[PDB]
RNA sequence: GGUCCGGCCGGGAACUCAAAGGAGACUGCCAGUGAUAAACUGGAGGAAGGUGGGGAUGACGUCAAGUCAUCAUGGCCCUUACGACCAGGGCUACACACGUGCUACAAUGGCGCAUACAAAGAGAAGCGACCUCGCGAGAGCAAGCGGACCUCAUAAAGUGCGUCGUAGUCCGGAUUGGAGUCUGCAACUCGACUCCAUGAAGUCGGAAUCGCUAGUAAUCGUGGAUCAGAAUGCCACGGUG
RNA sequence: CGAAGAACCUUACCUGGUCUUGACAUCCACGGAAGUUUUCAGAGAUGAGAAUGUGCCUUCGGGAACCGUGAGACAGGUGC
C-alpha cells in the first residue's frame, strides 16, 4: 500500500479513539447486548465509517493489508529484510 | 536470488542480534515498530560519522544508543553536548529515555560496513567504478583480513546496462558455520540509479 | 526397590518397573485388552519377548503414557529388552538379533514448503 | 542405484503364524487399516478350514502355491527382442503377484462382505478355476507360445 | 441468506417517513439507503433505492420488506 | 395406512421407511417414533396397531406433501413478481448462494456441453 | 510461592543471564530453587520469500523462547540482590514479581 | 504412605517428560578383496554405521524470467488533476473453457450406542470451563488463566456391539425453501455456521497424464497464523500405516 | 500465485456527491490553549452554527504542541 493509502488508515485509527475510548463502552455495551429498536440504530450508527470493525490495521512501517502479522507488528518483506541484518531478536532459519 | 545472501543465520549462531530486547507476545509489535522507526532517524543523524553499525538494547524502561564508528572524532563532537541532543530525538519516537554508549576502533579496513559507505561516497562523486571497490579491498588486505570479497552492482561509467563489480582476493567461504563473516549493505543514490553495495570480510575463523 | 528398562517408541515413552516374579500381565492397573483399543498389534508384541521368555521370570507392570496405540505396544518392546539385559547379557544379544533393543529408526517426518502432506509434492498437468 | 535393495522386516500372523499369511494382510491393506483387515483373515480361514483338508495354513499356502506364476514378462532391447520375454521370478515375488490378483477378484464380487467374497475365491484356488488363476494362463500362454529368448 | 434478528430500519428512511406522514407519493424517493426494511406507513410508495449507478423506483409491497430493499434492484445486468 | 402420498415402503426399518414420506426425513422419522413411544428395531413391515394412528397424526403436524410443495412454489413466484434477486435468478436458473458460475454451477446451468 | 520469569530467545544468553543472579540466590532461603527450565513457548513463522508470485518457496524462520524460573522460594531479607540489583538485561524478561 | 482412589495430599527425585551441558561414529576396529592406494563387501560392539534421519545449506552462471504494486529509485508524463475524500457498486459476473484442491460413488462400509489411545501450537478489544437455558449451532451466568498451571480439548479414524443388506440405496450430499445463530451500524450483489425439510449428480471414470522408494505413500483427524467475522487454501503436529 | 480469510471500508476500478499548497510533508506568517458535547441540512462526504474548556513558558510580541486560514517553493501519483 502506497504512502497515501497508509495515511488514510492512520487518520482512521486516530478517529477510532473519538468513536472508541469513552465512546467505546458507549458504542458497544450501553447500546447492544439487549437494552433496542429505532432508537439503538441511529445512535450506534454515529458516523458509520469509524469503529474497530472498520480498522483495516496494516503495518505501521510500510502498510499493505496482505501479508500481515498483527501479533508481532511485522509483515511479508519486513521479516526477511529486517531479520537478516538482525533487526528482530530471536529469529533464525527454521529447524524446529 | 543467488544464495540466500546469508548473514542472519550467522547472527543466529554466533553474536547476538543487532536489536536485542524483550517483550510479551502481543506487546512485541509496539516495541518492534518504535525501534525500526528510531533506528532510521538515528542512522540519518548518525551519517556524520562512518557507521560501523548502530545496535540497540532495550530493557523496556530505557533504550541504549550504542553506535560504534570509525569517526568517533565526530560522535563526541565537543564533549557530551553532541550526543545529548541526539538522545532527545530517541526519546520522541521510542518514548523512554536513552543513554550514550562507547564507540571503539579497529580500523575502517576491518568490519564490512566501513568499507561500504566509503566506496559509495566515491561513486556518488562519480569516480573510480572498477578501481573504486578495488582500492578499498587492497586497503582491507593491507592490514588484517583473511580475505575480503566485495560485490557491488554494475553500471560502470554510470552506464545503463549493468555488468557487476566483483573483485575478491584471499578467501571468503560463504557456507562456513564456524564463520567470522561480517556483512553490511549500502546503496548509492547516483544520478542514474541505485548501486547496491555488498562487503563480505572473513576476518577470522570464529 | 525395583529394576527399570526404558521404552522410547515413536512418540510414546514408557516407565517400566519390574517386580521379579511371574503371574501378572498388567499394564496401567489394566491389562492388554483393557488398556489397548483392541488393536491387532498388541497380541503380536507378546511373541518377540517369549524368545528369552517372560511371565516366568518377571512380572509385567508398565506405566506408559503419551503417543500412539500401536506406538505404545511398541514401547513395551523397548522397555522389556531393556529390562532383560539387567540380569544377564545373554538376554540382550538375542534382543538385538530380535531388533527390539534398537530404538525405532523411523520417526514422523516434517512437512516442508510446497508439500501438501509429509512428502507429497502436488500433482500437476501443465506439460 | 548404488548397492542393491535391503529387506524389510514384516511380522507373521500372531494366532497361527505364517509370514506368508501376514503378507496377505499387506496385500489387503487399503486405507492403511490393519485393524479392520485382521477380521477378514480369520473370516475366510474358517470357510476354508471346514471345506478343505490339509492344515489351516495349507488351506491358503499350498492352494495358492499352484496358481502363482513362475514367469513374469517385461521387455528390453538386449537379446535382440522387441518382445515380451519370460522371467523366472524369485519365489517370494511368485506369491505377491497371485495374492494381488486374488484380491482384485473379490472386489469384482458383490457376494456381500470382503469376508465371503475373497473366501469362496480362495476355496476355488485348490479347485483351479476363478479369474484369479486365469491370469497365469495368459502370461505363460503368451511366453511359451511366442517364446523369444529367455 | 440472513438478516439475523437485527434488520437495519435505517435512518435515511427515518427522515423520509417524517416527510411522508403528511404526504403520500409526491416524488420517487431519492434514497441511497439499501439496507432498509420499511414500516408499513412507507409501504405503498415508490422508494427509489440507489443501485450503485442511478436510482430505480420500486413499487414496494409487503414481501419486499421481508428482506432488504437493495435486493429488488439489480446491481449488474447480464445478457 | 399408506396415508398421504401413495406407498409406504417395507422390508426395512421403521425409521428408514418413514424417511420416505415426502417431507419426512432422517431426524423427523425417529422423532415420530419417539412420540408414538415405539421402536425402530421392528420394521414398518410389522405396522403396529398403535403406530397406525400416529402415522397420520404426526405427519399432520408437519408441513408435508402437497401443502408444503404448494407454499414453497407459491413463493418462487412471490419474489419473482417484486423484482427480487432470488426472483429473476430462478428464471435464468442461477443460484442465490454466491456460488462459482465462472467455473461450476452445473446443477443450475445443467452439465458441461 | 515466587515466580520470577526469565524468558529469552536463545539459550546461549538466557544462561549467561541465569548465571549473573543465581550466585547470591545460594545463600538465599533454605528451599530456594535452581532454574526450572519449562517447555518452550515457541514461535516460528513462514513468510513469503519474494515480492511477487509463487508460494512453494517461503522463507522459514524459528524462534524458541524457553522459560527458566530460578526462584528464591521461601523469602529472606537477602532477596533484594537477585531481584533488582544484579539483573536488568535487555533480552530477558526481567521479572520483579513475587 | 494418605486416600473423599483423582498426581487430588504430603512425600519422594527414581522414571518419563521437558531442555541446557555432555557421551558418541571417525570407514575407528575384525576378516576377505584391492596396488600391502583409497576404497569396496561382509562382521562386531553399540541407539545408530560407511552422505545415520530430517532441516537450514540454492556454486560460478542462464532465462533483457518475474516483481516501479512492500519499499527504494533514473527518466518521462499528470498538477481548480490518471491527484484527493466519501457513499454505493464492481473484486465472489456469465452463455462457456482450462488448472490446483475437496467429497462421494460404498459394506476393506455407512449410520446408532458406548468405548480406546495423542502430538504440537494459541491466548487480557482473548480463549472462554462451570451452572442455567437452548433439539442445535450456541446464548445467558461467569470461574480461571496473559498461561508445562487455566481455557481452546472432547483427538478422530480405530474397537467391542446394534443395525442396514449391494438397492442409487439405510449410500451420497449438491440444490433450494423455510427456520435460526454469530461478528458487526448494517451480511443486497459478495459472509460463514447450525436446524429441519428438500433431497442432486454419481453405481469408480475414454484418449492421456502426474504423484509417491518409508514413518513415505495412503487415509484419519488435531493445532496455528491472516482472522471483528468466512478455510475443502496455506502452514504445522501426531494416529494408524 | 501475489493475497497470511476481499461483506462496508478493503480498493487500486467504476458511477455519483465533493475538494484544490491540498488527504498525506517540511518550511514562513497570522488568528485561536488544545479541546468538549450537541443542533440543523445532506445519502454521507461535509458545511455552517449553538453552548462549554482556557494548558505549557514568555521578554508579553513571540513561541512549544495543536487546529483552521493565507501565501507560495512545493506536496501527491498503486501514473508509464
Curated annotation (Swiss-Prot), chain B:
One of its GO terms (molecular function) is rRNA binding. GO terms for biological process: cytoplasmic translation; ribosomal small subunit assembly. It holds the Pfam family KH_2. GO terms for cellular component: cytoplasm; cytosol; cytosolic small ribosomal subunit. InterPro entries: KH_dom, KH_dom-like_a/b, KH_dom_type_2, KH_sf_prok-type, Ribosomal_S3_C_sf, Ribosomal_uS3_bac-typ, Ribosomal_uS3_C, Ribosomal_uS3_CS. Residues 38-106 form the KH type-2 domain. Keywords: Ribonucleoprotein, Ribosomal protein, RNA-binding, rRNA-binding. Gene3D superfamilies: 3.30.300.20, Ribosomal protein S3, C-terminal domain. SMART domains: KH. It comes from the Bacteria. Part of the 30S ribosomal subunit. Forms a tight complex with proteins uS10 and uS14. With proteins uS4 and uS5 encircles the mRNA as it enters the ribosome, which may play a role in mRNA helicase processivity. Some nascent polypeptide chains are able to cross-link to this protein in situ. In collided ribosomes contacts ribosome rescue factor SmrB. Belongs to the universal ribosomal protein uS3 family. Binds the lower part of the 30S subunit head. Binds mRNA in the 70S ribosome, positioning it for translation. This is Small ribosomal subunit protein uS3. It comes from Escherichia coli (strain K12). The lineage of its organism: Bacteria, Pseudomonadati, Pseudomonadota, Gammaproteobacteria, Enterobacterales.
Curated annotation (Swiss-Prot), chain C:
GO terms for biological process: cytoplasmic translation. The keyword GTP-binding does not apply. GO terms for molecular function: RNA binding; structural constituent of ribosome; tRNA binding. Transmembrane segments: none annotated. Keywords: Ribonucleoprotein, Ribosomal protein, RNA-binding, tRNA-binding. One of its GO terms (cellular component) is cytosol. Belongs to the universal ribosomal protein uS9 family. The C-terminal tail plays a role in the affinity of the 30S P site for different tRNAs. Mutations that decrease this affinity are suppressed in the 70S ribosome. HAMAP family: Ribosomal_uS9_B (MF_00532_B). Part of the 30S ribosomal subunit. Contacts 16S rRNA. Cross-links to the P site tRNA and weakly to the A site tRNA. PANTHER family: RIBOSOMAL PROTEIN S9, SMALL RIBOSOMAL SUBUNIT PROTEIN US9M. This is Small ribosomal subunit protein uS9. It comes from Escherichia coli (strain K12). The gene is rpsI.
Swiss-Prot record, chain E:
InterPro entries: Ribosomal_uS19, Ribosomal_uS19_bac-type, Ribosomal_uS19_CS, Ribosomal_uS19_SF. Belongs to the universal ribosomal protein uS19 family. Part of the 30S ribosomal subunit. Binds S13 and L5 and cross-links to the A site tRNA. The keyword Aminoacyl-tRNA synthetase does not apply. One of its GO terms (molecular function) is rRNA binding. It comes from the Bacteria. The lineage of its organism: Bacteria, Pseudomonadati, Pseudomonadota, Gammaproteobacteria, Enterobacterales. Gene3D superfamilies: 30s Ribosomal Protein S19, Chain A (3.30.860.10). GO terms for biological process: cytoplasmic translation; ribosomal small subunit assembly. One of its GO terms (cellular component) is cytosol. This is Small ribosomal subunit protein uS19. In the E.coli 70S ribosome in the initiation state it has been modeled to contact the 23S rRNA of the 50S subunit forming part of bridge B1a; this bridge is broken in the model with bound EF-G. The 23S rRNA contact site in bridge B1a is modeled to differ in different ribosomal states, contacting alternately S13 or S19. In the 3.5 angstroms resolved ribosome structures the contacts between L5, S13 and S19 bridge B1b are different, confirming the dynamic nature of this interaction. Bridge B1a is not visible in the crystallized ribosomes due to 23S rRNA disorder. Protein S19 forms a complex with S13 that binds strongly to the 16S ribosomal RNA. Contacts the A site tRNA. Keywords: Ribonucleoprotein, Ribosomal protein, RNA-binding, rRNA-binding, tRNA-binding. Pfam families: Ribosomal_S19 (PF00203).
UniProtKB/Swiss-Prot annotation, chain F:
One of its GO terms (biological process) is cytoplasmic translation. SUPFAM superfamilies: S13-like H2TH domain (SSF46946). GO terms for molecular function: rRNA binding; structural constituent of ribosome; tRNA binding. PROSITE patterns: RIBOSOMAL_S13_1, RIBOSOMAL_S13_2. It comes from the Bacteria. Residues 93-113 are annotated as: Disordered. Keywords: Ribonucleoprotein, Ribosomal protein, RNA-binding, rRNA-binding, tRNA-binding. GO terms for cellular component: cytoplasm; cytosol; cytosolic small ribosomal subunit; small ribosomal subunit. Changing residue 104 to K: In PW097; partially suppresses a rimM deletion. Gene3D superfamilies: 1.10.8.50, 30s ribosomal protein s13, domain 2. Part of the 30S ribosomal subunit. Forms a loose heterodimer with protein S19. Cross-links to the P site tRNA and weakly to the A site tRNA. Forms two bridges to the 50S subunit in the 70S ribosome, contacting the 16S rRNA and proteins S19 and L5. Belongs to the universal ribosomal protein uS13 family. This is Small ribosomal subunit protein uS13. It comes from Escherichia coli (strain K12).
Amino acid at each position: 500500500a502506497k504512502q497515501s493509502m497508509k495515511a488514510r488508515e492512520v487518520k482512521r485509527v486516530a478517529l477510532a479513539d473519538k468513536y472508541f475510548a469513552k465512546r467505546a463502552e458507549l458504542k458497544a455495551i450501553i447500546s447492544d447486548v439487549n437494552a433496542r429498536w429505532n432508537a439503538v440504530l441511529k445512535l450506534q450508527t454515529l458516523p458509520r465509517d469509524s469503529s474497530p470493525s472498520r480498522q483495516r490495521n496494516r503495518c505501521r512501517q510500510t502498510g499493505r493489508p496482505h501479508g500481515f502479522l498483527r501479533k508481532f507488528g511485522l509483515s511479508r518483506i519486513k521479516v526477511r529484510e529486517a531479520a537478516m541484518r538482525g533487526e528482530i531478536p530471536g529469529l533464525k532459519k527454521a529447524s524446529w | 536470488g543467488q544464495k540466500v545472501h546469508p548473514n542472519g543465520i550467522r547472527l543466529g549462531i554466533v553474536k547476538p542480534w543487532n536489536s536485542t530486547w524483550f517483550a510479551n507476545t502481543k506487546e512485541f509489535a509496539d516495541n518492534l515498530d518504535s525501534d525500526f522507526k528510531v533506528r532510521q532517524y538515528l542512522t540519518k543523524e548518525l551519517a556524520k560519522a562512518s557507521v560501523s553499525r548502530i545496535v540497540i538494547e532495550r530493557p523496556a524502561k530505557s533504550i541504549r544508543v550504542t553506535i560504534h564508528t570509525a569517526r568517533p572524532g565526530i560522535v563526541i563532537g565537543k564533549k557530551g553536548e553532541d550526543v545529548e541532543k541526539l538522545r532527545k530525538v530517541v526519546a520522541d519516537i521510542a518514548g523512554v529515555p536513552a543513554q550514550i554508549n562507547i564507540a571503539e576502533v579497529r580500523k575502517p579496513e576491518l568490519d564490512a560496513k566501513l568499507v561500504a559507505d566509503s566506496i559509495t561516497s566515491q561513486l556518488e562523486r562519480r569516480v573510480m567504478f572498477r578501481r573504486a571497490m578495488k582500492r578499498a579491498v587492497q586497503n582491507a588486505m593491507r592490514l588484517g583480513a583473511k580475505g575480503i570479497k566485495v560485490e557491488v552492482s554494475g553500471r560502470l561509467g554510470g552506464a545503463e546496462i549493468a555488468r557487476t563489480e566483483w573483485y575478491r582476493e584471499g578467501r571468503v567461504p560463504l557456507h562456513t558455520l564456524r564463520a567470522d563473516i561480517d556483512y553490511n549493505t549500502s546503496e548509492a543514490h547516483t544520478t542514474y540509479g541505485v548501486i547496491g553495495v555488498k562487503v563480505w570480510i572473513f576476518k577470522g575463523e570464529i | 526397590n525395583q529394576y527399570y528398562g526404558t521404552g522410547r517408541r515413536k512418540s510414546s515413552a514408557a516407565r517400566v518397573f519390574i517386580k521379579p516374579g511371574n503371574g501378572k500381565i498388567v499394564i496401567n492397573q489394566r491389562s492388554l485388552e483393557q488398556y489397548f483399543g483392541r488393536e491387532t498389534a498388541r497380541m503380536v508384541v507378546r511373541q518377540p519377548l517369549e524368545l528369552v521368555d517372560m511371565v516366568e521370570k518377571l512380572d509385567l507392570y508398565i506405566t506408559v503414557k503419551g503417543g500412539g496405540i500401536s506406538g505404545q505396544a511398541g514401547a513395551i518392546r523397548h522397555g522389556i529388552t531393556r529390562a532383560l539385559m539387567e540380569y544377564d547379557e545373554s538376554l540382550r544379544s538375542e534382543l538385538r538379533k530380535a531388533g527390539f533393543v534398537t530404538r525405532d529408526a523411523r520417526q514422523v517426518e516434517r512437512k516442508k514448503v510446497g508439500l501438501r502432506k509429509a512428502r507429497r509434492r502436488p500433482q500437476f498437468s501443465k506439460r | 542405484r548404488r548397492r542393491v535393495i535391503g529387506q524389510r522386516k514384516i511380522l507373521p500372523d500372531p494366532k497361527f503364524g505364517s509370514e506368508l499369511l501376514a503378507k496377505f494382510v499387506n496385500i489387503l491393506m487399503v486405507d492403511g487399516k490393519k485393524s479392520t483387515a485382521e477380521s477378514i483373515v480369520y473370516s475366510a480361514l474358517e470357510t476354508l478350514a471346514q471345506r478343505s483338508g490339509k492344515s489351516e495354513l495349507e488351506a491358503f499356502e499350498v492352494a495358492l502355491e499352484n496358481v502363482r506364476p513362475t514367469v513374469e514378462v517385461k521387455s528390453r532391447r538386449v537379446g535382440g527382442s522387441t518382445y515380451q520375454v519370460p522371467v523366472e521370478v524369485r519365489p517370494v515375488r511368485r506369491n505377491a503377484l497371485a495374492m494381488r490378483w486374488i484380491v482384485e477378484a473379490a472386489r469384482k464380487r458383490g457376494d456381500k462382505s470382503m469376508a465371503l467374497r475373497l473366501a469362496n475365491e480362495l476355496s476355488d484356488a485348490a479347485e483351479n478355476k476363478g479369474t484369479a488363476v486365469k491370469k497365469r494362463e495368459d502370461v505363460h500362454r503368451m511366453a511359451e507360445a511366442n517364446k523369444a529368448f529367455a | 441468506r440472513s438478516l439475523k434478528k437485527g434488520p437495519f430500519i435505517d435512518l435515511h428512511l427515518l427522515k423520509k417517513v417524517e416527510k411522508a406522514v403528511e404526504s403520500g407519493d409526491k416524488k420517487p424517493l431519492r434514497t441511497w439507503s439499501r439496507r432498509s426494511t420499511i414500516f408499513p406507513n412507507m409501504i405503498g410508495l415508490t422508494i427509489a433505492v440507489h443501485n450503485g449507478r442511478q436510482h430505480v423506483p420500486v413499487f414496494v409491497t409487503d414481501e419486499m420488506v421481508g428482506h432488504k430493499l437493495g435486493e429488488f434492484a439489480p446491481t449488474r445486468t447480464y445478457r | 395406512a399408506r396415508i398421504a402420498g401413495i406407498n409406504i415402503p417395507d422390508h426395512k426399518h421403521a425409521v428408514i421407511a418413514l424417511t420416505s414420506i415426502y417431507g419426512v426425513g432422517k431426524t423427523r422419522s425417529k422423532a415420530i417414533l419417539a412420540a408414538a413411544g415405539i421402536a425402530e428395531d421392528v420394521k414398518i413391515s410389522e405396522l403396529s396397531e398403535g403406530q397406525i394412528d400416529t402415522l397420520r397424526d404426526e405427519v399432520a403436524k408437519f408441513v408435508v406433501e402437497g401443502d408444503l410443495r404448494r407454499e414453497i412454489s407459491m413463493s418462487i413466484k412471490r419474489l419473482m413478481d417484486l423484482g427480487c434477486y432470488r426472483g429473476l435468478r430462478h428464471r435464468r436458473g442461477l443460484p442465490v448462494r454466491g456460488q462459482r458460475t465462472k467455473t461450476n454451477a452445473r446443477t443450475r446451468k445443467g452439465p458441461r456441453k | 510461592r515466587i515466580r520470577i520469569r526469565l524468558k529469552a530467545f536463545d539459550h546461549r544468553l538466557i544462561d549467561q543471564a541465569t548465571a549473573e543472579i543465581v550466585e547470591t540466590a545460594k545463600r538465599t532461603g533454605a528451599q530456594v530453587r535452581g532454574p526450572i527450565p519449562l517447555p518452550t513457548r515457541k514461535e516460528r513463522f513462514t513468510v513469503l520469500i519474494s515480492p511477487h508470485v509463487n508460494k512453494d518457496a517461503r522463507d522459514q524462520y524459528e524462534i524458541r523462547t524457553h522459560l527458566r524460573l530460578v526462584d528464591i522460594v521461601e523469602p529472606t531479607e537477602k532477596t533484594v540482590d537477585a531481584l533488582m540489583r544484579l539483573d536488568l538485561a535487555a533480552g530477558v524478561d526481567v521479572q520483579i514479581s513475587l
